Amino acid sequence: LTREAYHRLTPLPHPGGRLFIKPGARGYRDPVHDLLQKTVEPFGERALDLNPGVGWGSLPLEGRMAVERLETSRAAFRCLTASGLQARLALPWEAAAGAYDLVVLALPAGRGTAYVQASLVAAARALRMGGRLYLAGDKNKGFERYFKEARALLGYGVVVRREGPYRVALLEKEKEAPPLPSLWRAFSARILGAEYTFHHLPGVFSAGKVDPASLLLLEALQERLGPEGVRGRQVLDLGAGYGALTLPLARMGAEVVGVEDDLASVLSLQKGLEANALKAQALHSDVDEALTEEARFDIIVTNPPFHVGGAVILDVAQAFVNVAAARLRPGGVFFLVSNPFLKYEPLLEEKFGAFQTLKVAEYKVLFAEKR
Ligand SMILES: Nc1ncnc2c1ncn2[C@@H]1O[C@H](CSCC[C@H](N)C(=O)O)[C@@H](O)[C@H]1O
Incomplete structure (x- = not known):
């Protein structure tokens, strides 16, 4: 790629809208995020996406719920902003406590156990009691281990979608984080x-x-x-x-x-x-x-x-x-x-x-x- 091409934001179609992507931004043609997009449904009024990338995984919530997004990657935030999607330059654990009905978390497995654990606790803290978490991942990249931890942090959890090694689960906050x-x-x-x-x-x-x-x-x-x-x-x-x-x-x-x-x-x-x-x-x-x-x-x-x-x-x-x-x-x-x-x-x-x-x-x- 030229430098201009590397930095270029390109809008891609989906039914009813468009989403900007760019080289170097996570969450595009990623099976974990793709499975989330096919799965997530509104619950309550306020949602938080803790690892949005270009924002495909939680996109079905946009316009049905108030969706906030906390993202660490500058490349990804350029895309989200271009797409008109509210997003903050923020660590997952900077999430407001007890302020959300729904959290979406594609497991950041590539960043390792400590980063994932911090993201899981941030999810649990962000939710109001009775709020829900969509947790997505890859059985080859710790999904079962992280899903077990999420269940321990929250309460009832169940797989709601599967494709190959990829999983989405839904969990309910039943205990204090x-x-x-x-x-x-x-x-x-x-x-x-x-x-x-x-x-x-x-x-x-x-x-x-x-x-x-x-x-x-x-x-x-x-x-x-x-x-x-x-x-x-x-x-x-x-x-x-x-x-x-x-x-x-x-x-x-x-x-x-x-x-x-x-x-x-x-x-x-x-x-x-x-x-x-x-x-x-x-x-x-x-x-x-x-x-x-x-x-x-x-x-x-x-x-x-x-x-x-x-x-x-x-x-x-x-x-x-x-x-x-x-x-x-x-x-x-x-x-x-x-x-x-x-x-x-x-x-x-x-x-x-x-x-x-x-x-x-x-x-x-x-x-x-x-x-
Ligand atoms: N689009 C991008 N722009 C700037 N840095 C990026 C980037 N994509 C990845 N990186 C960063 O590139 C680094 C490569 S690892 C090297 C880290 C450090 N210079 C050292 O030598 O220890 C990581 O910190 C990674 O987050």
């Missing part, structure tokens, strides 16, 4: 001779330790540029996460801008910067969406997202490369780290003209220079 679990975690790490304490909420990439690929990028970068090679330089960190690259680069004296699509990760980065007395811009952004048109950088770094077990580079990750080439000043440099068999080489050759391989073992670090 517990307090939110503890959400924040911290860990220390020594990187390039300096001590850092990272802080993060559930669901982030590489919770609890610095990812070895990220460490490798930093090692390649300091070897190439020197310990002073980053001072006073403008750096963009594409997909900043809780700041494994952002914090050390800020420490080394770079003026760093982190862009990150996931709200929980942006908040994590912000807490880490504060805790380590470091300053950087921690932007909630779909790739470079939050930047001015004119913004350019001296150095761009990235450990792009990847699909677990997948052989194909994600649209978002392809866009990171395209945006990197476009956002570098002449003579600016790009560092990217990935699993060794992801086909980044032809992409860098296309966008930069040439590239180098600075490291290759458990991961590869690729390098390019703007001409």
